[PDB]
Amino acid sequence: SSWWSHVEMGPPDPILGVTEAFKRDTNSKKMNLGVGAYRDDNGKPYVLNCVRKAEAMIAAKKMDKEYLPIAGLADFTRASAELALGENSEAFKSGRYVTVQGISGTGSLRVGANFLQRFFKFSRDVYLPKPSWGNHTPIFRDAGLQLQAYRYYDPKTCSLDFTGAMEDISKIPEKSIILLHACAHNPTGVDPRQEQWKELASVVKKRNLLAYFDMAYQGFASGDINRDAWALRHFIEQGIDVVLSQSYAHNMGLYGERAGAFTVICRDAEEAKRVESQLKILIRPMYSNPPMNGARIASLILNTPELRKEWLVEVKGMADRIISMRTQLVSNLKKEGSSHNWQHITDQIGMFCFTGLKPEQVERLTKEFSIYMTKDGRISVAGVASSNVGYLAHAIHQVTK
């Protein structure tokens, strides 16, 4: 009986733990369809061309590694704001925003969570969509806020239950906080339609709710970055001052370098200044200043015309491939003779498919075929390659037959 005799065995992360389990299997045909990580058509980690050139630029310049200001790389901070808001945006033009480099999406989310905990005097409730990325709970819960829920997904119909959402949302207490996924909702792969978004705006505005946008997949919903930032831009434009978290982990394939940002849209550039002051203060006693590599790479691509353009081509490339894989998946299922309707697989967008498989099926999949996915039936289509869509489909079928 020492200091930690009492500390119990905590369980493995529902998402990140799949990769740990996957790592150990000896099956040569194994597939890691758990975390949303882009794999190229060979089924290999893919580092974009533009990322590769960004890094070379950095190398060549023989840059130092001195500490970055607490808020991050100005150039990256400003270009991230700009990427979300759009260059024409009044918010951006007027400087009514504060963007701070964050430790990827998760890092940004928690900074905001912490910021709200401290400065959002109107409420302690955060409404998450049913269902949501498992991690939104703990992120909010550890920061000190309460979690609530709003209906979103209709499993019966494999789509968004708009009526349920609107009902739930029209009733959230005023001045509460609502978390919205900007695009490629995780894990359903179903976003509201633009008409739909417009109706949500109204209710949010009307109920005077703080809209918190989680934008982890800008460019993976349509394959177009501006198109994917529509909702977000629409709300700001309707006069809704949101807070936002951005991740460059998927769209730039910067996973491990941890590049991201957290933004608050304020009333004036002077409020923006005061909020920045306080955000610095929160970040300081947390990690002091942020990791420079991801931010340097992203800044160079973003601010370098030829780089940026290459990047957009590369993003289309990625989404495209994901599409082909959905398609094929479905085809192979029919080929295999599957009786089930697998239309949701091609209807869903972003990196995954919310399959509907029950936990007994998931289990079999891992054990008989060594195909790893989250227990909720969510699979990452992002990680399928031409060489194993066949295998995937056959398995799905066997376990479903």
CB-nearer residue toward ligand PPE: 131 or 223 = 131
Measured from the Cβ of residue 364, the count of other Cβ atoms closer than 10 Å reads 17
The stretch among 2-10, 100-108, 146-154, 384-392 that binds ligand PPE (CB under 6 A) is: 100-108
CB-nearer residue toward its own copies: 20 or 306 = 20
Which of 66, 87, 195, 360 lies at the binding interface for its own copies (CB under 8 A)? 66
CB-nearer residue toward ligand PPE: 104 or 218 = 104
Dihedral over Cα of 243, 268, 200, 342: its sign: negative
The stretch among 101-109, 116-124, 188-196, 310-318 that binds ligand PPE (CB under 6 A) is: 101-109
Tokens linked to 34: 């758990």
214 binds ligand PPE (CB under 6 A): yes
Residue 180, by phi and psi: left (phi above 0), alpha (psi -120 to 50) or beta? Answer: beta
The stretch among 160-168, 246-254, 307-315, 321-329 that binds its own copies (CB under 8 A) is: 246-254
Per-residue exposure over 341-360, b if at least 16 CB sit within 10 Å of its own CB, e if not = ebebbbebbbbbbbbbbeee
Contacted entry of ligand PPE, its own copies, none for residue 328, CB cut-off 5 to 8 Å set by kind? none
Query: Residues forming the annotated binding site?
Result: 36, 133, 186, 378
369 contact partners, CB below 8 Å, separation of at least 6: 27, 29, 31, 391, 395, 398
- CA proximity to 333, closest of 353, 309, 303: 353
E-strand ranges in 116-275 read 125-130, 146-151, 153-154, 159-160, 177-181, 210-215, 243-247, 260-265
112 binds its own copies (CB under 8 A): no
Query: Nearest 5°: phi and psi at 257?
Result: -85, -10
Binders of ligand PPE among residues 242 to 261 (CB under 6 A) are 247, 249, 260
Distance CA 372, CA 341 (A): 22
Contacted entry of its own copies, ligand PPE, none for residue 68, CB cut-off 5 to 8 Å set by kind? its own copies
Please check whether residue 378 is in contact with residue 187, taking contact to mean a CB–CB distance below 8 angstroms: yes
For residue 188, the minimal CB distance to its own copies (Å) is 21
Measured from the Cβ of residue 40, the count of other Cβ atoms closer than 10 Å reads 15
110 binds its own copies (CB under 8 A): yes
For residue 393, the minimal CB distance to its own copies (Å) is 25
Which of 36, 129, 223, 253 lies at the binding interface for ligand PPE (CB under 6 A)? 36
Measured from the Cβ of residue 280, the count of other Cβ atoms closer than 10 Å reads 15
Binders of ligand PPE among residues 215 to 234 (CB under 6 A) are 216
Binders of its own copies among residues 285 to 324 (CB under 8 A) are 285-294
Q: Are strands 260-265 and 243-247 parallel, antiparallel or unpaired?
A: antiparallel
Contacted entry of ligand PPE, its own copies, none for residue 186, CB cut-off 5 to 8 Å set by kind? ligand PPE
Contacted entry of ligand PPE, its own copies, none for residue 257, CB cut-off 5 to 8 Å set by kind? its own copies
121 binds its own copies (CB under 8 A): yes
Contacted entry of its own copies, ligand PPE, none for residue 256, CB cut-off 5 to 8 Å set by kind? its own copies
Rounded to the nearest 10 degrees, what angle do helices 389-398 and 359-369 cross at?
130
Chain residues binding ligand PPE by CB under 6 A are 15, 35-36, 104-106, 133, 135, 181, 186, 214, 216, 247, 249, 260, 288
